[PDB]
């Protein structure tokens, strides 16, 4: 994928001015180096490959860290996490995508389990990760029948097993994931992307049965966007994100701080 090259230019003395235009039009004015300056002639190699959509979002990033705290005692009762699925939680990522009003793509989810040991030993730990679709029965105990995962997609990970990871086909029931949403509920409520981008929820639970060593599971979740398209680019996020599925941004008793650096005087940068 190449960039045009630069052509020798010459001492114009034309009745035709290309430099003079009007932005009113709403158009970006078409003027190139040569147009305005006796230029050289340059063979350009420069490549936009990397500047490709897939090249951008086609990189794995973190979207969620789901910490589970092992409690020996009531073992079969707690010791399970839940996460309402979405990307709106981890700026880095969020912002990029929030670059466009719609996006379509499959997702490669990659996992990173971390065992923070608490007793002088770890023992043998086994995790389960059931992706639970909206409508599917939500587990309510480290032993909910739900972890029979008879139709659901569940993936298992143990101490020593290499990072798990899988692939997921663009979901949603419309052509694209909505990045933003100027609309409400069937009940005029919840003005938010939140209306749609319920994807279901992710759930983990240690399989290893009642044992000895108190410990902590810190499974981090990572996501690469595959086979990508997007439309209607929007200006980037300017400040910190407050909450998910909301554009909100005004913060408890603190300045509206952009990114713009201020200066003394315009006649000096």
């Amino acid at each position: 994928l190449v960039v045009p090259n630069i052509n020798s230019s010459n001492p114009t003395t034309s009745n035709s001015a290309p430099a003079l235009d009007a932005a009113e039009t709403g158009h970006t004015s078409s003027v190139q180096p040569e147009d305005v300056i006796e230029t050289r002639y340059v063979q350009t190699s420069q490549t936009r490959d990397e500047m490709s959509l897939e090249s951008f979002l086609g990189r794995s990033g973190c979207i969620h860290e789901s910490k589970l705290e092992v409690t020996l005692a009531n073992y079969n009762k707690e010791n399970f996490t839940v996460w309402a699925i979405n990307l709106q939680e981890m700026a880095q990522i969020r912002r990029k995508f929030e670059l466009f009003t719609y996006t379509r793509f499959d997702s490669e989810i990659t996992l990173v389990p971390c065992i923070s040991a608490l007793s002088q030993d770890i023992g043998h730990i086994t995790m389960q990760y059931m992706y639970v679709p909206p409508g599917a029965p939500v587990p309510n105990s480290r032993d909910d029948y739900a972890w029979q995962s008879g139709t659901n997609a569940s993936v298992f990970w143990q101490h020593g097993q290499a990072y798990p990871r899988f692939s997921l086909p663009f979901l949603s029931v419309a052509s694209a994931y909505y990045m933003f949403y100027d609309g409400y509920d069937e009940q005029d409520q919840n003005y938010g992307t939140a209306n749609t981008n319920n994807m279901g929820s992710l759930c983990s639970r240690i399989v290893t049965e009642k044992h000895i060593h108190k410990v902590h599971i810190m499974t981090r979740i990572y996501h690469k966007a595959k086979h990508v398209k997007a439309w209607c680019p929007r200006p980037p996020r300017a400040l910190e994100y407050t909450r998910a599925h909301r554009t909100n941004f005004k913060i408890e008793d603190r300045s509206i701080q952009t990114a713009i650096v201020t200066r003394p005087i315009i006649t000096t940068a």
């Binding site: 490959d49 490709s52 897939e54 086609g58 997921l168 086909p169 595959k226």
Partner: peptide, 25 residues
């Protein structure tokens, strides 16, 4: 099935559309 970028082989070992690697342009 092998090609030229910015020669190597690459068929899809996987049966599902999403399973497949990063697209081309």
């Amino acid at each position: 099935a092998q090609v030229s970028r910015q020669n190597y082989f690459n068929i899809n070992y996987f049966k599902d559309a999403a399973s497949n690697g990063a697209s081309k342009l």
